């Protein structure tokens, strides 16, 4: 609240949409990527409040270590070839270096791994924490793979 | 209006009614078995004897006494306004009893009030033990201070 | 579906027969059915034993 | 079908969920009739020779 | 069936009514348990009459 | 043979005989009211029976003592009944009307009271006021029917004469008996004759809006009307359903001895659980086949999303291993002298052992043959029964576990050894991430929420201004219109401008008695709140919500109990008996406001609500020192809430029965009528469960069956809970049932949890389901045909009830019940028609003229009739599955256009131009001397309209809707988002729609809704029968727009889809080859297998759509904006009405665009929608997979749609649907025959269409 | 586990140890009975069918490939969808998932029991490669016939 | 004391199983799919479609070939085991040609 | 309970004192269920009595 | 189908060069602002590196 009262940014309402308007399709493609993200995130002026409480977490690193939940994740593995995964995956490569715990690298790393499972295997840990692990379930130092 | 003007006009005079209740368990059979058998003999109350004679207690507390004590109180409806008072405030509340209903308090010790007082109805130690059922079926509410 | 070849197609009409023709198809692919004409559920003193 | 679409629960553990689900089959002794069944049958048909 | 009824005058004692301190129901096995009941005699017979 | 010789024609002109002409049916609309009750019993008397019907009456019933050693009067001055058999005995007995009635003037043998009886009951005679109490509870139980009785038996007899009735998959007649086998019609017909007797009158009272009259006979009973009603239902249900005689037999004896008995409605009370209990709580003892359904409740555990895996085969092993029904059944039997009904049906039920469809349909049956009273009695005795009750708490929360309060309330220690720690644990963590989420603190989410308790009929607004006359405010009393009296709309505008620390002693006052009447139940009695009340009361149903949809999430329909049913899965019903008279502030609310005061005390610390401001309290929860501590705005809310649960309610009782007995008095029991009801409910049972299955049990038990069974039986796996009902499903495992033993201890193990702390628990395991009072057995459902009745219609009010034009609209309400059950097709859809023309005609009395009211079939053809045999087709030709509307009228007429053609050319009506539809011949001529037109423009002409109309004040009016719209505000940034959204409209997006919704419309909507209810007579009234009767003059040109654009459309079927379940199982009961049409629809379409609360919620395009103005509006206006062009920023606009936050709300206009949206959301563009009897069956299947276009003949450059607007995919889908399914047999896949002007034209005609609104 | 006590016993007798060739006698009975019989081993069959969709963790779930194929991405005036086709195509016959549980445990039984497919499900004389639907026909059997 | 399987298996060593690709089931999904794409992209034969069916073909394809299906990896590594389990449980014991 | 099971000590020739099986984790279980973790905290704390 | 291939490098690229104040807002402005305010605070700052 404080920093929302102090701080001289706000939303610019239309970006999302003036950008976005120029896109160049076909109306016969079943499948638009512009309205797919366009819908997928919403702004909805209280994000902003989770975001200055994001910026705020970098005081008090030692005692809260802010991360993003499982529900932001694509839940299922996702896939490369599905277009809103990839979407999704652009959202979480965008957010995770903001938060303050020390493994975001990893949840970038395994977050893409997750993405392509069965285009290639890459040589791991062990057989528990394999390349379909979800992506949250790291979240430590021991856990991160040699590879 | 005393707390036992509706106590007193039962026919089976509901005093006597709770002199009843020795025969609920087989190994008290006598009244001052009772009084001896709920408490600690430090007047000090076991838990559990007096959870079961509360468990007994219950339905004579209910079935015959918010009917007869709702006639009564309808009855003093019909002629005047007045002061009524009674003990466990469930009576006043389940007996649709109209009217402002306030929850006070002494500012004093009120059991060994219950232990002085010579020649009422019943055992010494039988006033006690229905002052402790008394409180048990009254709510929780706020005290509220007489004065 | 010879007859009804011989019925011109543009000049469809509900009749009764156009009924139970696709009553007579519905029922013909329920009795090609792989598993129903073998499953039975009573017993035969043989399956039962 | 079933090759191409198959689900797991989110939270298996497999000495879990197979203990909880092999357990109740077995107090039951309905295998240990039929030896005394084949007893009987050894033993008629050789009555029989 | 003893420790049944020691196990009700448990509960009985405790005044709860699960007796916590139980003498059956546990995961230990005792199917060569044997109690002085009246079926034997000195003997080691029946006592049907 | 009198009915054959008036309806010569008629009577096969819809069975299927002969051509149905207009003429025809307007004869005998005229021959259907030119008519008379002598009339119906000389044709009662002319038929003869088959001596199955036959049985012997007692004289007992009619002889019957006096009414005056039956009431009584209260100290008080009350009327109250005197009890005879326990206190349930309180009702109508039916004795002594003969001496309390005048004779009509005009009338010989009829009347009404004498009002000298009124007068002393006026002036205090305490007999007058026995009499008029028992003279006026007798009018309203017999002012319970919709319609006179006797033209109901009429449509009976017009139907059932023409005989037996050919089916076209069959081949057969109908093997159903006729007039000459029923007891209802001979016993029925019996009882008239022996109470007129001689006399020359013969109907013992007739139906009037004025109030019935009664047949003055010294015998006349009271309770003659409801014993009528049970004949007539069975009457109809005979033949209408295929009951056998037998069991109907059964039935009127019930009812016969119901009559005899000392009060009706008691007995009928009382006897409710016979045909259950001896029936289908006893069935299936020891089987041996079948075939049962395969489901599986999916992995994610509130999908409601199914998988029928098949047909599986029944095994010996499935017996009923549900406990005994011997005791309780025959003791039943025997305490009411009817122990021969009980040996009967206990004889039958072990009779049957295969899971079939003749067990299933016997139970169906007995479902059937039971009564469909509706329980009457004085509101007095009501609100003296039910509400003088207070629940058992045998453990209460000893008096040292709570601390030291904080305002009103204590809070718990959490060292408790009381259960309620685990209460307070949920509450306290789902009232801290209630409040964590942001979406509560949207001001539009405030708005909608403020908007939220406008429903549910608010009452007390009376009482409401005079509390608020005593609390000293100025008031506008906005003199000079009609209805606002009686709204809660004016009661939120008298406190649009009021501080709430000035209102906060206003939610003290007391509360209205709405009544209602139930089937077999006792009345219930809804009841409001007023708006400051309903308005402090939020973050309690915040909460209840949150539990509700996200932590235990249980539910908020059918094949749950298709699911719960399966055989090697076993079901538990759980109810409670009378929910609302147990939560009390004893055991729960103290400790449900504790832990929603702290719950969100973490997250609250300066947070304000909109109207409340903080505060500050002391606290002894410190209790070795005592400070003061500051109070947030949901603890305000909250810290007011506590003295309100804490003190009891009072309740205003005013009766219009006994005469003048008005009186106010406490009562603990939480209101049946708020937005905190359900959901708080539901939210305690699914709480209760979870600390029984986490605590409870393994305290409480000894061997390790029970405990090793609860120990995988959780609330998120197994437990299902909507307000009284509750349900186990109880997993089979690999063993196949589980051992019946440790249920049964379980559950007296509930039983016990039920009456140790303020509970019971009605558990009944049967083998069997019920929910939501939906029958299961073997995963096949039940329809209960009792909950349905034909004849009754609740009033519980005297007040005078609406004339003419809607008692055929719940005519068409009894048409689609009869439909969703599983009925008799041959004989129900010719019954309609039967009661369809009897309520066509209506005599008014109008100035000079005597004007007839005249609607042609064609009215009810375009609501869902179907026709049986048109223009020379085929008999029974197509089903009743139509959509009552433009889509079906279209089905049909495109199933049969060229055998129209062909009947058009017969009797010859010939113009040149070759019309692209019809060809040579024409249509103006003849659909105008047929009145097709007529009767399908009649069709869209509104109902029962009544209207302002009286030109009120401007002034006082403006004022009005400016208080509204003050109401509807409490944030201004709402106001600059939907005012800068205006000027975005008015910019761009004005114009080419001619109607934008919006949300300043909606003080205005607000006002026209509640001008709906001024009961006005005369004027408006006379101003629709004009104009029907200019309606019915104007000669018209074509069809609707819709519908012209429709008929451009061809198709083409061929290939009958591959079966979608087996038949040799029983889905539904009253569906079989037997009932070939509805079963074969069954079996070759599939079953819907969903919710469809979720599925349908899936089709609402906004997320939360809720606003409160018909958000179907909102989206399809969205859609209509996207179709005709209009660039982003007008979308934007139109969604900026609704007003978001215009960030996101450009985002959502954005996406609308590129997204193709699902096939059902275009259905709002196009103003279609799903009808009601669609989703038994699985839809979503044949829309997006058999009905299609590139037929297999092709391509045709015809069957072409342009790349922009493939909007039209969507609407091709519902047009080949409906005619794919409006036909009888399979529904056959359907093939794109071409439409004749290419998708650019057609499209084009749309859009011309939606040019206009 | 099962428990069995660890004392002296009370020597009782639980006849139940017999020899290989009692059990091998019996089997010829019951295969000699079962002889050329089809309606009887498929009670059998299908008894072990229910009993392994009551032990498997394993939840088949057809609406994932739904999922999955509601992503794919193509033109619309192209009117030979491949995906809905298979959608399609996917929809099984009336309702039955036992088929697959029924082949998994027709593994038990080679010797008397050989399981086919239908030939209803070979594709009816065409072969039309051209044709998609005889194509996505020769892929859901290919994927079947190993089984 | 044998179960003839016609099928691989090995057990799993994990408890908490997870999805890979790696066994004779998923391999011959994957063989026989980029064999139909091999069908398609068969230029002497099947040229006479169109370039936006083929690529959505392809992709339609490529996709059913990385469908995530927990079917096979039950099928080695977990079926046979409980088929072991069960099969000494039978009114009928098994019966078995090589 | 715990009184018994610190007279016990006494009364060791005759009876002995265990804990059942009630109070252990079910069905094995896992060192990932966090429920089954606390419950072998429970145990162990409990075992040297 | 090569026209999602062209918009999605198109939508990508234009992505990329969207205009947005945040970045320098976070890299200039906000750690100053923060440095501004922490002294301020009742509860003091507390970090590990």
Not at chain 8, 62 to 84: D, F, R, W
Request: some cysteine; aromatic content about 10%.
């Amino acid at each position: 609240v404080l920093l929302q009262r102090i701080s001289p940014l706000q939303i610019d309402p239309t970006i999302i949409s003036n950008t976005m308007s120029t896109v160049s399709e076909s109306t016969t493609q079943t499948l638009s990527p512009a309205s797919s993200i366009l819908g997928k995130l919403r702004p909805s002026n209280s994000d902003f409040s989770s975001f200055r409480v994001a910026l705020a977490g970098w005081l008090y690193n030692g005692v809260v270590t802010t991360v993003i939940d499982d529900s932001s994740y694509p839940k299922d593995g996702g896939s490369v070839t599905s277009l809103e995964n990839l979407w999704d995956f652009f959202i979480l490569a965008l957010a995770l270096p903001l938060t303050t715990d020390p493994c975001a690298p990893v949840k970038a790393f395994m977050t893409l791994a997750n993405m392509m499972v069965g285009f290639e295997t890459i040589p791991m840990d062990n057989q528990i924490y394999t390349q379909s692990r979800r992506a949250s379930a790291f979240s430590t130092p021991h856990t991160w793979p040699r590879c | 209006v005393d707390s036992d003007e509706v106590g007193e006009q039962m026919e089976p005079t509901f005093e006597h009614a709770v002199m009843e209740i020795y025969k609920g368990i087989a190994g008290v059979d006598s009244l001052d078995d009772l009084t001896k058998w709920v408490l600690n003999s430090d007047l000090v109350p076991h838990d559990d004897r007096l959870g079961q004679l509360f468990q007994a207690f219950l339905p004579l507390a209910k079935d015959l006494l918010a009917p007869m004590a709702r006639q009564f109180y309808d009855n003093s409806m019909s002629e005047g306004r007045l002061l009524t008072f009674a003990h466990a405030d469930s009576e006043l509340l389940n007996a649709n009893y109209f009217g402002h209903l306030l929850r006070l308090k002494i500012p004093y010790i009120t059991e060994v009030n219950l232990m002085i007082r010579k020649n009422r109805e019943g055992g010494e130690l039988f006033q006690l033990v229905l002052s402790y059922l008394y409180k048990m079926y009254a709510t929780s509410a706020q005290p509220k201070w007489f004065g | 579906a010879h007859v009804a070849s011989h019925g011109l197609h543009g000049n469809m009409t509900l009749t009764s027969s156009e009924i139970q023709r696709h009553i007579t198809e519905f029922i013909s692919s329920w009795q090609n059915h792989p598993i129903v004409q073998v499953s039975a559920d009573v017993e035969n003193r043989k399956t039962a034993q | 079908v079933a090759l191409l679409s198959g689900k797991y629960p989110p939270d298996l553990v497999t000495n879990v969920w197979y203990a909880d689900a092999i357990y109740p089959m077995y107090a039951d002794t309905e295998v240990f009739s039929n030896l005394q069944r084949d007893v009987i049958t050894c033993e008629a048909v050789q009555t029989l020779v | 069936d003893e420790a049944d009824d020691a196990t009700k005058k448990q509960a009985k004692d405790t005044e709860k009514a699960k007796a916590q301190v139980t003498y059956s129901d546990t995961g230990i096995n005792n199917a060569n348990e044997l109690s002085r009941s009246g079926n034997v005699d000195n003997e080691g017979g029946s006592n049907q009459k | 043979s009198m009915i054959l010789t008036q309806f010569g024609p008629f009577i096969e002109s819809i069975s299927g005989i002969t051509d149905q002409s207009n003429d025809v049916f307007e004869n005998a609309a005229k021959a259907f009211s030119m008519f008379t009750r002598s009339d119906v019993y000389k044709a009662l008397d002319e038929i003869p029976f088959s001596e199955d019907a036959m049985l012997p009456i007692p004289p007992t019933i009619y002889t019957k003592p006096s009414h005056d050693s039956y009431y009584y009067i209260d100290a008080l001055n009350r009327v109250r009944r005197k009890t005879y058999q326990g206190p349930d005995d309180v009702y109508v007995p039916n004795c002594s009307i003969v001496e309390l009635l005048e004779p009509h003037e005009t009338l010989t043998s009829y009347g009404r009271l004498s009002e000298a009886i009124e007068n002393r009951a006026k002036d205090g005679d305490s007999q007058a006021r026995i009499a008029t109490t028992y003279g006026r509870i007798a009018e309203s139980q017999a002012r319970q029917i919709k319609a006179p009785l006797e033209k109901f038996v009429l449509a009976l007899l017009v139907a059932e004469a023409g005989g037996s009735l050919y089916d076209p998959v069959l081949q057969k007649y109908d093997e159903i008996p006729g007039l000459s086998h029923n007891c209802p019609l001979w016993c029925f017909r019996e009882i008239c004759r022996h109470i007129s007797g001689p006399l020359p009158d013969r109907a013992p009272y007739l139906y009037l809006s004025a109030g019935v009259f009664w047949l003055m006979s010294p015998r006349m009973t009271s309770a003659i009307p409801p014993l009528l009603s049970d004949l007539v239902n069975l009457a109809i249900l005979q033949q209408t359903a295929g009951l056998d005689p037998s069991l109907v037999r059964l039935g009127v004896q019930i009812c016969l001895h119901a009559a005899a008995s000392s009060s009706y409605a008691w007995f009928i009370l009382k006897t409710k659980s016979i045909f259950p209990q001896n029936t289908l709580h006893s069935m299936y003892e020891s089987l041996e086949g079948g075939y049962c359904p395969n489901l599986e409740w999916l992995e994610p555990r509130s999908d409601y999303k199914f998988m029928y895996m098949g047909a599986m085969p029944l095994s010996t092993k499935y017996a009923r291993s549900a406990p005994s029904n011997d005791k309780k059944a025959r003791e039943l039997g025997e305490k009411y002298g009817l122990s021969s009904v009980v040996s009967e049906l206990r004889r039958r039920t072990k009779t049957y052992s295969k899971h079939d469809f003749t067990s299933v349909r016997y139970i169906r049956d007995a479902m059937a043959c039971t009564s469909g009273i509706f329980l009457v009695r004085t509101p007095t005795e009501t609100v003296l029964q039910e509400y003088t009750q207070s629940p058992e708490i045998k453990v209460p929360i000893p008096q040292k576990d709570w601390t030291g309060p904080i305002g009103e309330i204590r809070i718990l220690k959490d060292t408790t050894s009381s259960i309620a720690r685990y209460l307070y644990r949920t509450w306290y963590l789902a009232a801290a991430r209630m409040a964590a989420q942001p979406r509560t603190w949207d001001p539009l989410f405030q708005a909608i929420m403020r908007s939220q308790y406008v429903t549910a009929r608010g009452g007390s607004g009376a009482t409401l201004r005079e509390s608020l006359y005593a609390i000293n405010v100025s008031l506008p009393d906005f003199k000079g219109l009609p209805v606002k009296a009686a709204t809660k709309i004016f009661q939120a505008a008298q406190l649009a401008n009021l501080p709430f620390s000035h209102t906060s002693v206003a939610i003290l006052a007391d509360t209205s008695m709405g009544l209602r009447n139930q089937v077999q139940r006792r009345p219930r009695s809804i009841m409001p709140l007023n708006v400051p009340q309903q308005q402090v009361s939020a973050p309690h149903t915040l909460t209840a919500d949150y539990i509700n949809y996200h932590m235990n999430l249980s539910t908020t329909v059918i094949p749950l109990g298709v699911y719960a049913s399966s055989p090697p899965n076993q079901s538990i019903n759980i109810d409670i008996s009378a929910c609302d008279a147990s939560i009390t502030w004893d055991f729960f609310l103290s400790v449900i406001m504790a832990a929603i005061h702290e719950g969100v005390a973490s997250s609250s610390i300066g947070k304000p609500f909109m109207g409340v401001p903080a505060s500050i309290v002391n606290d002894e929860s410190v209790v070795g020192v005592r400070a003061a501590r500051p109070i947030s705005g949901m603890q305000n809310m909250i810290q007011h809430l506590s003295k309100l649960y804490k003190r009891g309610f009072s309740y205003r009782v005013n009766d219009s029965f006994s005469p003048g007995n008005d009186f106010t008095h406490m009562t603990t029991t939480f209101p049946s009528g708020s937005t905190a009801t359900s959901t708080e409910h539901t939210a305690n049972n699914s709480t209760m469960m979870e600390t029984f299955l986490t605590v409870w049990g393994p305290e409480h038990t000894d061997d390790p069956d029970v405990l090793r069974l609860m120990k995988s039986l959780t609330i998120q796996r197994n437990y299902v809970c909507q307000g009284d009902d509750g349900l186990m499903i109880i997993d089979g495992n690999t063993a196949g049932k589980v051992n019946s033993e440790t249920i049964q201890k379980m559950l007296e193990l509930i039983s016990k949890y039920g009456e140790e702390f303020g509970w019971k628990y009605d558990i009944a395991y049967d083998g069997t389901a019920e929910y939501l009072k939906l029958y299961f057995i073997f995963g096949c459902r039940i329809p209960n045909l009792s909950r349905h009745p034909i004849v009754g219609k609740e009033r519980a009010n005297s007040s005078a009830e609406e004339p003419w034009p809607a008692i055929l609209d719940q005519i068409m309400g009894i048409f689609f019940n009869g439909v969703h059950d599983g009925l008799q097709w041959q004989r129900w859809i010719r019954y309609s028609w039967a009661l369809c023309c009897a309520f066509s005609r209506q005599r008014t009395m109008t100035g000079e003229s005597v004007g007839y009211l005249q609607y042609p079939m064609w009215s009810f053809v375009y609501w869902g009739l179907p026709l049986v045999k048109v223009f020379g087709s085929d008999p029974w030709i197509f089903s009743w599955y139509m959509p009552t509307g433009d889509l079906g009228m279209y089905s049909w007429i495109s199933l049969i256009r060229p055998l129209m053609t062909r009947w058009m050319v017969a009797n010859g009506y010939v113009t040149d131009k070759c019309s692209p539809v019809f060809g040579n011949a024409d249509y103006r001529k003849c659909f105008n001397e047929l009145k097709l037109y007529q009767g399908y423009y009649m069709a869209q002409l509104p109902r029962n309209p009544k209207k302002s109309g009286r030109a009120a004040p401007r002034e006082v009016r403006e004022q009005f809707t400016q208080a509204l719209s003050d109401y509807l505000m409490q944030n201004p940034e709402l106001k600059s988002r939907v005012l800068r959204g205006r000027s975005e409209w008015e910019k761009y997006g004005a114009g080419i729609i001619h109607n934008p919704p919006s949300l300043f419309d909606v003080p205005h909507k607000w006002y026209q809704g509640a001008q709906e209810a001024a009961t006005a007579t005369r004027e408006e009234l006379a101003e629709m029968d004009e104009t029907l009767m200019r309606a019915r003059k104007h000669s018209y040109s074509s069809f609707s727009k819709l519908l012209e654009a429709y008929l451009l459309v061809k198709w083409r079927m061929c290939e009958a889809r591959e079966p979608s379940v087996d038949l040799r199982l029983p889905l539904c009961a009253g569906i079989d080859p037997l009932n070939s049409d509805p079963f074969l629809k069954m079996v070759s379409v599939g079953p819907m297998l969903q919710s469809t609360r979720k599925y349908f919620a899936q089709t609402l395009f906004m997320a939360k759509t809720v606003s409160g103005l018909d958000v179907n509006a909102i989206d399809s206006a969205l859609l209509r904006l996207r179709t005709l062009g209009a660039d982003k920023k007008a979308l934007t606009a139109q969604l900026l009405m609704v007003g978001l936050q215009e960030s996101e709300a450009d985002a959502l206009a954005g996406k609308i665009m590129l997204q193709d949206v699902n096939t059902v959301q275009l259905a709002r563009v196009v103003n279609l929608a799903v009808p009601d009897t669609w989703m038994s069956l699985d839809f979503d299947t044949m829309f997006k997979h058999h009905v299609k276009l590139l037929p297999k003949d092709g391509r045709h450059l015809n069957t072409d749609i342009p790349p922009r607007m493939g909007w039209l995919r969507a609407i091709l889908r519902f047009l080949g649907a409906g005619m794919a399914m409006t036909a009888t047999g399979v529904a056959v896949d359907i093939y794109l025959e071409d439409i004749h002007g290419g998708g650019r034209s057609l499209g084009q005609r749309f859009m011309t269409w939606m040019r206009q609104e | 586990t099962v428990t069995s006590p660890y004392a002296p016993s009370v020597n009782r007798l639980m006849p139940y140890r017999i020899s290989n060739a009692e059990r091998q006698i019996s089997q010829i009975i019951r295969v000699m009975n079962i002889g050329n019989n089809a309606t009887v081993i498929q009670p059998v069959l299908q008894d072990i069918s229910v009993l392994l969709q009551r032990i498997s963790p394993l939840q088949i779930d057809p609406t994932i490939i739904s999922n999955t194929m509601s992503t794919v991405s193509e033109s619309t005036t192209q009117t030979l969808s491949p995906a809905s086709s298979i959608l399609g195509k996917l929809r099984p016959s009336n309702s039955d998932f036992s088929s697959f549980r029924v082949a998994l445990a027709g593994w038990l039984y080679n010797g008397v029991v050989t399981t086919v497919i239908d030939d209803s499900s070979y594709p009816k004389d065409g072969g039309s490669v051209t044709s998609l639907e005889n194509l996505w026909d020769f892929f859901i059997l290919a994927l079947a016939l190993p089984l | 004391e044998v179960l003839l399987l016609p099928i691989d298996h090995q057990p799993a060593n994990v408890t908490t199983p997870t999805l890979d690709f790696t066994n004779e089931l998923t391999n011959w999904r994957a063989r026989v799919c980029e064999l139909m794409k091999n069908l398609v992209d068969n230029q002497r034969y099947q040229p006479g479609w169109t370039q936006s069916l083929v690529s959505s073909m392809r992709g339609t394809l490529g996709k059913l070939k990385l469908i995530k299906s927990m079917t096979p990896m039950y099928l080695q590594q977990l079926a046979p085991v409980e088929l072991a389990v069960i099969a000494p449980m039978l009114p009928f014991p098994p019966f078995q040609v090589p």
